[PDB]
Scaffold this active site. Structure first.
Site, PDB file in Angstrom:
ATOM      1  N   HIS A   1       0.837  -1.198   0.000  1.00 15.47           N
ATOM      2  CA  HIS A   1       0.000   0.000   0.000  1.00 15.47           C
ATOM      3  C   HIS A   1       0.879   1.259   0.000  1.00 15.47           C
ATOM      4  O   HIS A   1       1.261   1.792   1.058  1.00 15.47           O
ATOM      5  CB  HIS A   1      -0.948   0.010   1.193  1.00 15.47           C
ATOM      6  CG  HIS A   1      -2.086   0.964   1.041  1.00 15.47           C
ATOM      7  ND1 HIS A   1      -2.089   1.992   0.122  1.00 15.47           N
ATOM      8  CD2 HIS A   1      -3.305   0.973   1.651  1.00 15.47           C
ATOM      9  CE1 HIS A   1      -3.245   2.636   0.213  1.00 15.47           C
ATOM     10  NE2 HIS A   1      -4.012   2.022   1.126  1.00 15.47           N
TER      11      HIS A   1
ATOM     12  N   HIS B   1      -2.569   6.747  -1.137  1.00 13.30           N
ATOM     13  CA  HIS B   1      -3.640   7.285  -0.284  1.00 13.30           C
ATOM     14  C   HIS B   1      -3.151   7.912   1.011  1.00 13.30           C
ATOM     15  O   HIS B   1      -3.866   7.981   1.988  1.00 13.30           O
ATOM     16  CB  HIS B   1      -4.715   6.224  -0.032  1.00 13.30           C
ATOM     17  CG  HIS B   1      -5.376   5.765  -1.297  1.00 13.30           C
ATOM     18  ND1 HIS B   1      -6.143   4.616  -1.362  1.00 13.30           N
ATOM     19  CD2 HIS B   1      -5.367   6.282  -2.561  1.00 13.30           C
ATOM     20  CE1 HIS B   1      -6.594   4.483  -2.599  1.00 13.30           C
ATOM     21  NE2 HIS B   1      -6.148   5.470  -3.347  1.00 13.30           N
TER      22      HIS B   1
ATOM     23  N   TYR C   1      -0.768   7.012   3.162  1.00 14.79           N
ATOM     24  CA  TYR C   1      -0.248   6.158   4.252  1.00 14.79           C
ATOM     25  C   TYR C   1       1.300   6.221   4.256  1.00 14.79           C
ATOM     26  O   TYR C   1       1.874   7.086   3.583  1.00 14.79           O
ATOM     27  CB  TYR C   1      -0.876   4.777   4.230  1.00 14.79           C
ATOM     28  CG  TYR C   1      -2.371   4.899   4.363  1.00 14.79           C
ATOM     29  CD1 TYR C   1      -2.951   5.303   5.571  1.00 14.79           C
ATOM     30  CD2 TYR C   1      -3.201   4.623   3.304  1.00 14.79           C
ATOM     31  CE1 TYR C   1      -4.310   5.435   5.688  1.00 14.79           C
ATOM     32  CE2 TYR C   1      -4.557   4.781   3.411  1.00 14.79           C
ATOM     33  CZ  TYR C   1      -5.111   5.196   4.607  1.00 14.79           C
ATOM     34  OH  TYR C   1      -6.506   5.329   4.680  1.00 14.79           O
TER      35      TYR C   1
ATOM     36  N   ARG D   1       0.417  -0.677  -5.003  1.00 20.01           N
ATOM     37  CA  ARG D   1      -0.616   0.323  -5.298  1.00 20.01           C
ATOM     38  C   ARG D   1      -0.011   1.707  -5.051  1.00 20.01           C
ATOM     39  O   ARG D   1       0.507   1.977  -3.966  1.00 20.01           O
ATOM     40  CB  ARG D   1      -1.893   0.134  -4.486  1.00 20.01           C
ATOM     41  CG  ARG D   1      -3.064   0.920  -5.128  1.00 20.01           C
ATOM     42  CD  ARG D   1      -4.397   0.616  -4.466  1.00 20.01           C
ATOM     43  NE  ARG D   1      -5.493   0.840  -5.394  1.00 20.01           N
ATOM     44  CZ  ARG D   1      -6.771   0.991  -5.065  1.00 20.01           C
ATOM     45  NH1 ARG D   1      -7.127   1.299  -3.844  1.00 20.01           N
ATOM     46  NH2 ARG D   1      -7.686   0.938  -6.020  1.00 20.01           N
TER      47      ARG D   1
ATOM     48  N   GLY E   1     -14.126  -1.001  -6.549  1.00 23.73           N
ATOM     49  CA  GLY E   1     -14.277  -0.914  -5.110  1.00 23.73           C
ATOM     50  C   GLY E   1     -15.750  -1.037  -4.706  1.00 23.73           C
ATOM     51  O   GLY E   1     -16.232  -2.096  -4.312  1.00 23.73           O
ATOM     52  N   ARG E   2     -16.469   0.079  -4.787  1.00 26.49           N
ATOM     53  CA  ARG E   2     -17.853   0.116  -4.330  1.00 26.49           C
ATOM     54  C   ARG E   2     -18.761  -0.865  -5.036  1.00 26.49           C
ATOM     55  O   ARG E   2     -19.614  -1.490  -4.381  1.00 26.49           O
ATOM     56  CB  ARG E   2     -18.382   1.542  -4.353  1.00 26.49           C
ATOM     57  CG  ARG E   2     -17.712   2.409  -3.303  1.00 26.49           C
ATOM     58  CD  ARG E   2     -17.946   3.880  -3.565  1.00 26.49           C
ATOM     59  NE  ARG E   2     -17.191   4.344  -4.721  1.00 26.49           N
ATOM     60  CZ  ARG E   2     -17.220   5.581  -5.204  1.00 26.49           C
ATOM     61  NH1 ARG E   2     -17.948   6.518  -4.613  1.00 26.49           N
ATOM     62  NH2 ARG E   2     -16.461   5.892  -6.247  1.00 26.49           N
TER      63      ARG E   2
HETATM   64  C1  LIG Z   1     -15.240   1.695   1.996  1.00 22.98           C
HETATM   65  C2  LIG Z   1     -13.901   1.982   1.344  1.00 22.98           C
HETATM   66  C3  LIG Z   1     -12.729   1.403   1.810  1.00 22.98           C
HETATM   67  C4  LIG Z   1     -11.523   1.552   1.096  1.00 22.98           C
HETATM   68  N1  LIG Z   1     -10.425   0.892   1.571  1.00 22.98           N
HETATM   69  C5  LIG Z   1      -9.256   0.963   0.859  1.00 22.98           C
HETATM   70  C6  LIG Z   1      -8.147   0.214   1.280  1.00 22.98           C
HETATM   71  O1  LIG Z   1      -8.158  -0.595   2.226  1.00 22.98           O
HETATM   72  N2  LIG Z   1      -7.013   0.294   0.487  1.00 22.98           N
HETATM   73  C7  LIG Z   1      -6.944   1.082  -0.647  1.00 22.98           C
HETATM   74  O2  LIG Z   1      -5.874   1.144  -1.264  1.00 22.98           O
HETATM   75  N3  LIG Z   1      -8.024   1.773  -1.053  1.00 22.98           N
HETATM   76  C8  LIG Z   1      -9.179   1.667  -0.337  1.00 22.98           C
HETATM   77  N4  LIG Z   1     -10.291   2.311  -0.830  1.00 22.98           N
HETATM   78  C9  LIG Z   1     -10.300   2.815  -2.213  1.00 22.98           C
HETATM   79  C10 LIG Z   1     -10.816   1.751  -3.146  1.00 22.98           C
HETATM   80  O3  LIG Z   1      -9.918   0.658  -3.253  1.00 22.98           O
HETATM   81  C11 LIG Z   1     -11.083   2.326  -4.539  1.00 22.98           C
HETATM   82  O4  LIG Z   1      -9.811   2.779  -5.047  1.00 22.98           O
HETATM   83  C12 LIG Z   1     -12.103   3.487  -4.495  1.00 22.98           C
HETATM   84  O5  LIG Z   1     -13.269   3.058  -3.809  1.00 22.98           O
HETATM   85  C13 LIG Z   1     -12.468   4.053  -5.865  1.00 22.98           C
HETATM   86  O6  LIG Z   1     -12.977   3.029  -6.738  1.00 22.98           O
HETATM   87  P1  LIG Z   1     -14.542   2.718  -7.010  1.00 22.98           P
HETATM   88  O7  LIG Z   1     -15.113   3.941  -7.729  1.00 22.98           O
HETATM   89  O8  LIG Z   1     -14.501   1.496  -7.890  1.00 22.98           O
HETATM   90  O9  LIG Z   1     -15.203   2.488  -5.660  1.00 22.98           O
HETATM   91  C14 LIG Z   1     -11.492   2.229  -0.106  1.00 22.98           C
HETATM   92  C15 LIG Z   1     -12.689   2.816  -0.568  1.00 22.98           C
HETATM   93  C16 LIG Z   1     -13.888   2.682   0.130  1.00 22.98           C
HETATM   94  C17 LIG Z   1     -15.166   3.204  -0.509  1.00 22.98           C
HETATM   95  O1  LIG Z   2      -6.628   2.668   2.775  1.00 26.05           O
HETATM   96  N1  LIG Z   2      -7.470   3.487   2.212  1.00 26.05           N
HETATM   97  O2  LIG Z   2      -7.145   4.045   1.083  1.00 26.05           O
HETATM   98  C1  LIG Z   2      -8.571   3.882   2.856  1.00 26.05           C
HETATM   99  C2  LIG Z   2      -8.922   3.274   4.009  1.00 26.05           C
HETATM  100  C3  LIG Z   2     -10.163   3.668   4.807  1.00 26.05           C
HETATM  101  C4  LIG Z   2     -10.716   5.016   4.361  1.00 26.05           C
HETATM  102  C5  LIG Z   2     -10.792   5.070   2.842  1.00 26.05           C
HETATM  103  C6  LIG Z   2      -9.392   5.016   2.273  1.00 26.05           C
END
Ligand SMILES: Cc1cc2nc3c(=O)[nH]c(=O)nc-3n(C[C@H](O)[C@H](O)[C@H](O)COP(=O)(O)O)c2cc1C
Ligand SMILES: O=[N+]([O-])C1=CCCCC1
Length: 362
Positions: free
Chosen positions: A179, A182, A184, A231, A321-322
Protein backbone atom coordinates in the site's frame (compact mmCIF):
# COMPACT_ATOMS: atom_id res chain seq x y z
CA UNK A 1 -14.96 -7.67 -25.01
CA UNK A 2 -11.64 -8.43 -23.30
CA UNK A 3 -12.75 -8.02 -19.68
CA UNK A 4 -13.68 -11.70 -19.52
CA UNK A 5 -10.41 -13.03 -20.87
CA UNK A 6 -7.55 -14.42 -18.81
CA UNK A 7 -4.51 -12.48 -17.65
CA UNK A 8 -1.21 -13.66 -16.21
CA UNK A 9 -0.51 -11.68 -13.01
CA UNK A 10 2.98 -12.69 -11.94
CA UNK A 11 2.74 -16.23 -10.61
CA UNK A 12 -1.07 -16.31 -10.79
CA UNK A 13 -3.41 -16.63 -13.78
CA UNK A 14 -6.60 -14.59 -13.43
CA UNK A 15 -9.56 -15.92 -15.51
CA UNK A 16 -10.89 -12.38 -16.13
CA UNK A 17 -9.80 -8.76 -15.72
CA UNK A 18 -12.48 -7.69 -13.21
CA UNK A 19 -10.64 -7.29 -9.91
CA UNK A 20 -11.89 -6.50 -6.41
CA UNK A 21 -10.15 -3.39 -5.13
CA UNK A 22 -8.79 -3.27 -1.56
CA UNK A 23 -11.63 -2.17 0.76
CA UNK A 24 -11.27 -1.36 4.44
CA UNK A 25 -14.37 -2.58 6.23
CA UNK A 26 -13.31 -2.39 9.92
CA UNK A 27 -14.97 -5.60 11.17
CA UNK A 28 -11.97 -7.33 12.78
CA UNK A 29 -11.89 -8.45 16.41
CA UNK A 30 -10.28 -6.38 19.13
CA UNK A 31 -8.22 -7.08 21.08
CA UNK A 32 -5.80 -8.63 18.61
CA UNK A 33 -6.92 -7.11 15.26
CA UNK A 34 -8.04 -10.59 14.23
CA UNK A 35 -9.80 -11.46 10.98
CA UNK A 36 -13.07 -13.39 11.36
CA UNK A 37 -15.14 -16.15 9.75
CA UNK A 38 -17.61 -13.41 8.72
CA UNK A 39 -14.80 -11.76 6.75
CA UNK A 40 -14.04 -15.18 5.30
CA UNK A 41 -17.61 -15.50 4.05
CA UNK A 42 -17.48 -12.04 2.48
CA UNK A 43 -14.32 -12.90 0.55
CA UNK A 44 -15.65 -16.34 -0.47
CA UNK A 45 -18.76 -14.70 -1.91
CA UNK A 46 -16.50 -12.63 -4.22
CA UNK A 47 -14.22 -15.47 -5.32
CA UNK A 48 -15.27 -15.21 -8.99
CA UNK A 49 -13.22 -11.99 -9.20
CA UNK A 50 -10.23 -12.30 -11.48
CA UNK A 51 -8.25 -11.32 -8.36
CA UNK A 52 -9.44 -10.27 -4.89
CA UNK A 53 -7.21 -7.65 -3.25
CA UNK A 54 -7.90 -7.66 0.47
CA UNK A 55 -8.64 -4.84 2.82
CA UNK A 56 -5.51 -3.03 3.96
CA UNK A 57 -3.83 -5.14 6.65
CA UNK A 58 -1.19 -4.10 9.24
CA UNK A 59 2.38 -5.24 8.90
CA UNK A 60 2.88 -4.65 12.65
CA UNK A 61 1.03 -3.26 15.66
CA UNK A 62 2.70 0.10 15.07
CA UNK A 63 1.20 0.06 11.57
CA UNK A 64 -2.36 0.31 12.94
CA UNK A 65 -4.33 3.45 12.27
CA UNK A 66 -7.98 2.26 12.27
CA UNK A 67 -9.92 0.34 14.97
CA UNK A 68 -11.19 -2.86 13.33
CA UNK A 69 -8.54 -3.16 10.59
CA UNK A 70 -6.82 -6.56 10.63
CA UNK A 71 -3.16 -7.37 11.06
CA UNK A 72 -0.80 -9.97 9.65
CA UNK A 73 1.88 -9.85 12.35
CA UNK A 74 0.65 -12.18 15.10
CA UNK A 75 0.20 -15.95 15.27
CA UNK A 76 -3.54 -15.58 15.80
CA UNK A 77 -3.84 -13.30 12.76
CA UNK A 78 -1.88 -15.76 10.64
CA UNK A 79 -4.18 -18.59 11.77
CA UNK A 80 -7.35 -16.62 11.03
CA UNK A 81 -6.12 -15.52 7.58
CA UNK A 82 -5.19 -19.13 6.73
CA UNK A 83 -8.88 -20.10 7.11
CA UNK A 84 -9.93 -17.14 4.93
CA UNK A 85 -7.55 -17.90 2.07
CA UNK A 86 -8.44 -21.62 2.24
CA UNK A 87 -12.10 -20.67 1.81
CA UNK A 88 -11.34 -18.45 -1.19
CA UNK A 89 -9.28 -21.24 -2.73
CA UNK A 90 -12.06 -23.77 -2.14
CA UNK A 91 -14.16 -21.51 -4.39
CA UNK A 92 -11.38 -21.40 -7.04
CA UNK A 93 -10.52 -17.78 -6.29
CA UNK A 94 -7.24 -15.87 -6.02
CA UNK A 95 -6.51 -13.41 -3.20
CA UNK A 96 -3.77 -10.82 -2.63
CA UNK A 97 -3.26 -9.24 0.76
CA UNK A 98 -2.83 -5.44 0.75
CA UNK A 99 -0.17 -4.61 3.36
CA UNK A 100 0.05 -1.14 4.93
CA UNK A 101 1.62 0.96 7.57
CA UNK A 102 -0.76 3.83 8.18
CA UNK A 103 1.93 6.19 9.47
CA UNK A 104 0.42 9.54 10.45
CA UNK A 105 -3.18 8.56 9.48
CA UNK A 106 -3.61 7.12 12.94
CA UNK A 107 -4.30 8.01 16.57
CA UNK A 108 -2.20 7.61 19.71
CA UNK A 109 -5.00 5.64 21.46
CA UNK A 110 -4.51 2.69 19.12
CA UNK A 111 -0.70 2.79 18.98
CA UNK A 112 1.57 0.58 21.12
CA UNK A 113 1.98 2.26 24.53
CA UNK A 114 -0.50 4.98 23.58
CA UNK A 115 2.24 6.90 21.79
CA UNK A 116 2.17 9.22 18.81
CA UNK A 117 2.18 7.43 15.46
CA UNK A 118 5.22 7.68 13.17
CA UNK A 119 5.84 9.34 9.82
CA UNK A 120 8.53 10.80 7.61
CA UNK A 121 8.13 14.18 9.38
CA UNK A 122 6.35 15.56 12.44
CA UNK A 123 3.39 16.99 10.51
CA UNK A 124 -0.26 16.27 11.29
CA UNK A 125 -2.20 14.57 8.50
CA UNK A 126 -5.04 17.03 9.09
CA UNK A 127 -7.63 14.38 8.43
CA UNK A 128 -9.63 11.79 10.33
CA UNK A 129 -9.31 8.11 11.05
CA UNK A 130 -11.80 5.62 12.47
CA UNK A 131 -11.81 4.47 16.09
CA UNK A 132 -14.43 2.44 17.96
CA UNK A 133 -16.64 3.78 20.74
CA UNK A 134 -17.50 1.99 24.00
CA UNK A 135 -20.13 -0.04 22.17
CA UNK A 136 -17.80 -1.11 19.40
CA UNK A 137 -19.19 1.20 16.73
CA UNK A 138 -17.02 3.06 14.21
CA UNK A 139 -16.44 6.75 14.98
CA UNK A 140 -14.36 9.37 13.19
CA UNK A 141 -11.52 11.07 15.09
CA UNK A 142 -8.92 13.64 14.16
CA UNK A 143 -5.46 12.23 13.51
CA UNK A 144 -2.66 12.57 16.09
CA UNK A 145 0.47 14.59 15.23
CA UNK A 146 3.17 12.08 14.41
CA UNK A 147 6.79 11.60 15.46
CA UNK A 148 9.40 11.70 12.67
CA UNK A 149 11.11 8.31 12.32
CA UNK A 150 14.77 8.34 13.24
CA UNK A 151 17.18 7.17 10.58
CA UNK A 152 18.06 4.12 12.64
CA UNK A 153 14.39 3.09 12.76
CA UNK A 154 14.08 2.74 8.96
CA UNK A 155 15.63 -0.77 8.71
CA UNK A 156 13.01 -1.96 11.20
CA UNK A 157 10.17 -0.65 9.03
CA UNK A 158 11.65 -2.46 6.04
CA UNK A 159 11.95 -5.62 8.12
CA UNK A 160 8.35 -5.30 9.25
CA UNK A 161 7.20 -5.31 5.61
CA UNK A 162 9.49 -8.29 4.91
CA UNK A 163 8.18 -10.20 7.91
CA UNK A 164 4.55 -9.49 7.04
CA UNK A 165 5.25 -10.89 3.53
CA UNK A 166 6.73 -14.06 5.08
CA UNK A 167 3.56 -14.27 7.14
CA UNK A 168 1.35 -13.60 4.09
CA UNK A 169 2.98 -16.39 2.09
CA UNK A 170 2.47 -18.73 5.03
CA UNK A 171 -1.14 -17.55 5.39
CA UNK A 172 -1.96 -18.75 1.86
CA UNK A 173 -2.22 -15.49 -0.05
CA UNK A 174 -1.46 -15.71 -3.77
CA UNK A 175 0.14 -12.24 -4.02
CA UNK A 176 0.94 -9.24 -1.84
CA UNK A 177 0.02 -5.65 -2.68
CA UNK A 178 2.17 -2.96 -1.03
CA UNK A 179 0.00 0.00 0.00
CA UNK A 180 2.08 2.88 -1.38
CA UNK A 181 -1.01 5.10 -1.96
CA UNK A 182 -3.64 7.29 -0.28
CA UNK A 183 -1.40 9.14 2.13
CA UNK A 184 -0.25 6.16 4.25
CA UNK A 185 3.36 5.67 5.38
CA UNK A 186 4.99 4.83 2.06
CA UNK A 187 3.18 7.71 0.32
CA UNK A 188 4.11 10.02 3.25
CA UNK A 189 7.74 9.45 2.31
CA UNK A 190 7.09 9.74 -1.47
CA UNK A 191 5.29 13.11 -1.23
CA UNK A 192 7.24 16.35 -0.69
CA UNK A 193 4.16 17.72 1.10
CA UNK A 194 4.42 15.22 3.95
CA UNK A 195 8.16 14.60 3.76
CA UNK A 196 10.40 17.47 4.94
CA UNK A 197 13.34 15.26 5.84
CA UNK A 198 16.85 16.42 5.04
CA UNK A 199 18.50 13.00 5.27
CA UNK A 200 18.77 10.22 2.66
CA UNK A 201 15.01 9.59 2.90
CA UNK A 202 13.91 13.11 1.89
CA UNK A 203 14.58 15.92 -0.58
CA UNK A 204 15.25 14.49 -4.02
CA UNK A 205 12.78 12.08 -5.63
CA UNK A 206 15.45 9.37 -5.35
CA UNK A 207 15.53 9.93 -1.58
CA UNK A 208 11.73 10.17 -1.28
CA UNK A 209 11.29 6.88 -3.14
CA UNK A 210 14.15 5.22 -1.22
CA UNK A 211 11.98 3.62 1.47
CA UNK A 212 9.40 2.19 -0.91
CA UNK A 213 12.11 0.74 -3.16
CA UNK A 214 13.95 -0.79 -0.14
CA UNK A 215 10.62 -2.37 0.82
CA UNK A 216 10.05 -3.67 -2.72
CA UNK A 217 13.53 -5.21 -2.78
CA UNK A 218 13.13 -6.76 0.68
CA UNK A 219 9.79 -8.36 -0.19
CA UNK A 220 10.94 -9.63 -3.60
CA UNK A 221 13.89 -11.25 -1.84
CA UNK A 222 11.66 -12.75 0.86
CA UNK A 223 9.25 -14.33 -1.66
CA UNK A 224 9.58 -13.67 -5.42
CA UNK A 225 9.11 -10.59 -7.63
CA UNK A 226 6.27 -12.36 -9.42
CA UNK A 227 4.33 -12.37 -6.13
CA UNK A 228 4.56 -8.62 -5.48
CA UNK A 229 2.23 -5.86 -6.56
CA UNK A 230 2.17 -2.22 -5.54
CA UNK A 231 -0.62 0.32 -5.30
CA UNK A 232 0.24 3.97 -5.99
CA UNK A 233 -1.85 7.14 -6.20
CA UNK A 234 0.86 9.38 -7.70
CA UNK A 235 -1.22 11.99 -9.60
CA UNK A 236 -3.51 14.30 -7.64
CA UNK A 237 -4.34 14.65 -3.94
CA UNK A 238 -5.49 11.78 -1.66
CA UNK A 239 -6.46 12.26 2.01
CA UNK A 240 -4.63 15.58 2.02
CA UNK A 241 -1.41 14.24 0.56
CA UNK A 242 -0.62 15.77 -2.81
CA UNK A 243 2.21 14.50 -5.03
CA UNK A 244 4.23 17.67 -5.18
CA UNK A 245 5.08 20.09 -7.91
CA UNK A 246 6.65 17.58 -10.30
CA UNK A 247 4.16 14.76 -9.87
CA UNK A 248 4.31 13.27 -13.38
CA UNK A 249 8.11 13.21 -13.59
CA UNK A 250 8.39 11.84 -10.08
CA UNK A 251 5.80 9.14 -10.87
CA UNK A 252 7.69 8.06 -13.98
CA UNK A 253 10.90 7.86 -11.99
CA UNK A 254 9.30 5.50 -9.46
CA UNK A 255 7.64 3.42 -12.17
CA UNK A 256 10.94 2.98 -14.09
CA UNK A 257 12.56 1.89 -10.85
CA UNK A 258 9.77 -0.58 -10.08
CA UNK A 259 10.07 -2.02 -13.59
CA UNK A 260 13.67 -2.98 -12.91
CA UNK A 261 12.50 -5.36 -10.17
CA UNK A 262 10.18 -7.29 -12.52
CA UNK A 263 7.29 -7.17 -10.07
CA UNK A 264 3.89 -8.70 -10.84
CA UNK A 265 1.81 -5.53 -11.12
CA UNK A 266 1.36 -1.76 -10.83
CA UNK A 267 -2.07 -0.75 -9.47
CA UNK A 268 -2.87 2.92 -10.11
CA UNK A 269 -5.56 4.55 -7.96
CA UNK A 270 -6.46 7.43 -10.24
CA UNK A 271 -8.83 9.51 -8.12
CA UNK A 272 -10.41 9.74 -4.69
CA UNK A 273 -14.22 9.53 -4.30
CA UNK A 274 -14.71 13.25 -4.92
CA UNK A 275 -13.12 12.94 -8.36
CA UNK A 276 -10.74 15.08 -10.32
CA UNK A 277 -8.93 15.48 -13.59
CA UNK A 278 -8.56 12.32 -15.63
CA UNK A 279 -5.16 10.87 -16.44
CA UNK A 280 -3.96 12.13 -19.84
CA UNK A 281 -3.54 9.54 -22.56
CA UNK A 282 0.00 10.77 -22.93
CA UNK A 283 0.71 10.01 -19.28
CA UNK A 284 -0.83 6.53 -19.64
CA UNK A 285 1.42 5.91 -22.65
CA UNK A 286 4.54 6.97 -20.73
CA UNK A 287 3.63 4.62 -17.89
CA UNK A 288 2.92 1.77 -20.30
CA UNK A 289 6.29 2.07 -22.09
CA UNK A 290 8.15 2.03 -18.80
CA UNK A 291 6.47 -0.84 -16.97
CA UNK A 292 6.45 -4.39 -18.25
CA UNK A 293 4.09 -6.06 -15.80
CA UNK A 294 0.35 -5.90 -15.40
CA UNK A 295 -1.21 -2.47 -15.01
CA UNK A 296 -4.47 -2.24 -13.00
CA UNK A 297 -6.57 0.93 -13.26
CA UNK A 298 -8.92 2.03 -10.48
CA UNK A 299 -11.14 4.90 -9.44
CA UNK A 300 -14.75 5.40 -10.51
CA UNK A 301 -14.28 3.08 -13.50
CA UNK A 302 -17.04 1.65 -15.60
CA UNK A 303 -16.78 -1.62 -17.53
CA UNK A 304 -16.88 0.44 -20.73
CA UNK A 305 -13.92 2.60 -19.67
CA UNK A 306 -11.96 -0.52 -18.73
CA UNK A 307 -12.68 -2.13 -22.11
CA UNK A 308 -11.67 1.05 -23.91
CA UNK A 309 -8.31 1.34 -22.08
CA UNK A 310 -7.56 -2.39 -22.39
CA UNK A 311 -8.39 -2.12 -26.10
CA UNK A 312 -5.99 0.78 -26.40
CA UNK A 313 -3.22 -1.37 -24.90
CA UNK A 314 -2.82 0.98 -21.94
CA UNK A 315 -4.02 -1.11 -18.97
CA UNK A 316 -4.58 -4.85 -18.41
CA UNK A 317 -7.23 -4.97 -15.68
CA UNK A 318 -9.62 -2.85 -13.62
CA UNK A 319 -10.23 -2.87 -9.89
CA UNK A 320 -13.73 -2.00 -8.72
CA UNK A 321 -14.28 -0.91 -5.11
CA UNK A 322 -17.85 0.12 -4.33
CA UNK A 323 -19.42 -2.03 -7.02
CA UNK A 324 -17.65 -5.04 -5.36
CA UNK A 325 -18.96 -4.08 -1.91
CA UNK A 326 -22.49 -4.40 -3.34
CA UNK A 327 -22.15 -7.16 -5.98
CA UNK A 328 -20.51 -10.41 -4.96
CA UNK A 329 -21.01 -11.69 -8.51
CA UNK A 330 -19.93 -8.46 -10.21
CA UNK A 331 -18.19 -10.53 -12.92
CA UNK A 332 -21.42 -12.26 -13.97
CA UNK A 333 -23.38 -9.02 -13.77
CA UNK A 334 -20.95 -7.18 -16.04
CA UNK A 335 -20.78 -10.13 -18.42
CA UNK A 336 -24.60 -10.32 -18.66
CA UNK A 337 -25.17 -6.56 -18.61
CA UNK A 338 -27.36 -6.98 -15.56
CA UNK A 339 -28.28 -4.25 -13.09
CA UNK A 340 -26.06 -3.71 -10.06
CA UNK A 341 -27.36 -3.97 -6.50
CA UNK A 342 -28.06 -0.72 -4.69
CA UNK A 343 -25.16 0.34 -2.46
CA UNK A 344 -25.70 1.05 1.25
CA UNK A 345 -22.85 3.39 2.30
CA UNK A 346 -23.88 3.59 5.92
CA UNK A 347 -22.56 0.04 6.41
CA UNK A 348 -19.26 0.40 4.54
CA UNK A 349 -17.36 0.81 7.85
CA UNK A 350 -17.83 -1.26 10.98
CA UNK A 351 -20.76 -3.28 12.19
CA UNK A 352 -21.55 -6.85 11.22
CA UNK A 353 -23.12 -8.99 8.51
CA UNK A 354 -25.64 -6.30 7.49
CA UNK A 355 -24.27 -4.38 4.51
CA UNK A 356 -21.37 -6.87 4.30
CA UNK A 357 -22.47 -10.46 3.48
CA UNK A 358 -26.15 -9.72 2.69
CA UNK A 359 -25.83 -8.35 -0.83
CA UNK A 360 -27.32 -10.98 -3.17
CA UNK A 361 -26.04 -12.57 -6.30
CA UNK A 362 -28.18 -12.73 -9.38
C1 LIG B 1 -15.24 1.70 2.00
C2 LIG B 1 -13.90 1.98 1.34
C3 LIG B 1 -12.73 1.40 1.81
C4 LIG B 1 -11.52 1.55 1.10
N1 LIG B 1 -10.43 0.89 1.57
C5 LIG B 1 -9.26 0.96 0.86
C6 LIG B 1 -8.15 0.21 1.28
O1 LIG B 1 -8.16 -0.60 2.23
N2 LIG B 1 -7.01 0.29 0.49
C7 LIG B 1 -6.94 1.08 -0.65
O2 LIG B 1 -5.87 1.14 -1.26
N3 LIG B 1 -8.02 1.77 -1.05
C8 LIG B 1 -9.18 1.67 -0.34
N4 LIG B 1 -10.29 2.31 -0.83
C9 LIG B 1 -10.30 2.81 -2.21
C10 LIG B 1 -10.82 1.75 -3.15
O3 LIG B 1 -9.92 0.66 -3.25
C11 LIG B 1 -11.08 2.33 -4.54
O4 LIG B 1 -9.81 2.78 -5.05
C12 LIG B 1 -12.10 3.49 -4.49
O5 LIG B 1 -13.27 3.06 -3.81
C13 LIG B 1 -12.47 4.05 -5.86
O6 LIG B 1 -12.98 3.03 -6.74
P1 LIG B 1 -14.54 2.72 -7.01
O7 LIG B 1 -15.11 3.94 -7.73
O8 LIG B 1 -14.50 1.50 -7.89
O9 LIG B 1 -15.20 2.49 -5.66
C14 LIG B 1 -11.49 2.23 -0.11
C15 LIG B 1 -12.69 2.82 -0.57
C16 LIG B 1 -13.89 2.68 0.13
C17 LIG B 1 -15.17 3.20 -0.51
O1 LIG C 1 -6.63 2.67 2.77
N1 LIG C 1 -7.47 3.49 2.21
O2 LIG C 1 -7.14 4.04 1.08
C1 LIG C 1 -8.57 3.88 2.86
C2 LIG C 1 -8.92 3.27 4.01
C3 LIG C 1 -10.16 3.67 4.81
C4 LIG C 1 -10.72 5.02 4.36
C5 LIG C 1 -10.79 5.07 2.84
C6 LIG C 1 -9.39 5.02 2.27
Amino acid sequence: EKLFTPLKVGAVTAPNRVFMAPLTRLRSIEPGDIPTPLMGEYYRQRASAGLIISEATQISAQAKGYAGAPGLHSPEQIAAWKKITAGVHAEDGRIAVQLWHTGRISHSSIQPGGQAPVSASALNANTRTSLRDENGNAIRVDTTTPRALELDEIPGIVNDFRQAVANAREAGFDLVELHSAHGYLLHQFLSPSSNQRTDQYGGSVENRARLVLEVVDAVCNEWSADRIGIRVSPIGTFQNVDNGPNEEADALYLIEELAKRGIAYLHMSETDLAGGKPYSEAFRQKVRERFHGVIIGAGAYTAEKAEDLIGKGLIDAVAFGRDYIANPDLVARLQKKAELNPQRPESFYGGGAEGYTDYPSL
